[PDB]
Paper text:
EzrA comprises a single, N-terminal trans-membrane (TM) spanning helix followed by an ~60-kDa cytoplasmic domain15, which sequence analysis suggests forms an α-helical coiled-coil. The BsEzrA22–562 and the shorter SaEzrA24–214 rods comprise multiple copies of the same ~100 amino acid, triple helical bundle; BsEzrA22–562 contains five such repeats and SaEzrA24–214 contains just two. Although many proteins are known to comprise bundles of antiparallel α-helices, EzrA is, to the best of our knowledge, the only bacterial protein that is formed from serial spectrin-like repeats.
To obtain higher resolution structural information on EzrA, several fragments from different EzrA homologues were subjected to crystallization. Its structure was solved by molecular replacement using model phases from the equivalent portion of BsEzrA22–562, and was refined to a final crystallographic Rfree of 0.25. The structures of SaEzrA24–214 and BsEzrA22–562, which share only 20% sequence identity, superpose with root mean square deviations (RMSDs) of 2.4 Å on 154 paired Cα atoms. As also observed in several spectrins, the SaEzrA24–214 structure reveals intimate interactions at the interface between repeats involving the linker helix and loop residues. For example, the linker residues Tyr135 and Ile131 interact with loop residues Thr62, Leu56 and Tyr193. The angle between the two repeats in SaEzrA24–214 is 34°, suggesting that full-length EzrA from S. aureus will also have a pronounced bend.
Author numbering: 23 to 216
């Protein structure tokens, strides 16, 4: 009966040895292909630390749970042995989950770099169009025109500011900055019907 309980244990050993090969680092190396500084580097550093905390909390203890399972089985402590394997699998479930959480955490960052640039491209174009609408239809706005020419000029430094924040790897401030800019350009454009 032990010989066929040993299969449960062997399946656990196969599972440990394969989850030791989850590409945590290949995942995180994707962040290096962006600007590895600022908030980006902070998140990269924090995730390396988590992997040490995860490795020691969830992976190191497994080996012993499996050794206890073998010893207990051998003495015919069948349920006790099964418990140690259940525990081992629970621990590996967490390690696996901590990987999944990092595919997701990094995907989020990739998505923000992409979406940050989408907004920036939109703001460049809108700026250009608004600046031209004023310079070519000055008369058509009446007296509210000089306030507009200077207010639209105030978007130009705010574009350059985005380039700086992005270049420093501050993807979060970059996003909040460019979203706010888009919002305000938007409301200024509604107003510009009249």
């Amino acid at each position: 009966m032990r010989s066929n309980k040993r299969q449960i244990i062997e399946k656990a050993i196969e599972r440990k040895n394969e989850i030791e090969t989850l590409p945590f680092d290949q995942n995180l190396a994707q962040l290096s292909k962006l600007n590895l500084k600022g908030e980006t580097k902070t998140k990269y550093d924090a995730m390396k630390k988590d992997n040490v905390e995860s490795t020691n909390k969830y992976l190191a203890p497994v080996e012993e749970k499996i050794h206890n399972a073998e010893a207990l089985l051998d003495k015919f402590s069948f349920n006790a042995s099964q418990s140690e394997i259940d525990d081992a699998n629970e621990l590996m479930d967490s390690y696996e989950q901590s990987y999944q959480q990092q595919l997701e955490d990094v995907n989020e960052i990739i998505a923000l770099y992409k979406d940050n640039d989408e907004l920036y491209d939109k703001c460049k174009v809108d700026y250009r169009e608004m600046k031209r609408d004023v310079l070519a239809n000055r008369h058509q706005f009446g007296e509210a025109a000089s306030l507009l020419e200077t207010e639209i000029e105030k978007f130009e430094p705010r574009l350059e500011q985005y380039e700086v924040l992005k270049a420093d790897g501050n993807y979060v401030q970059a996003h909040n900055h460019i979203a706010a800019l888009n919002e305000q350009m938007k409301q200024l454009r509604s107003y510009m019907h009249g």
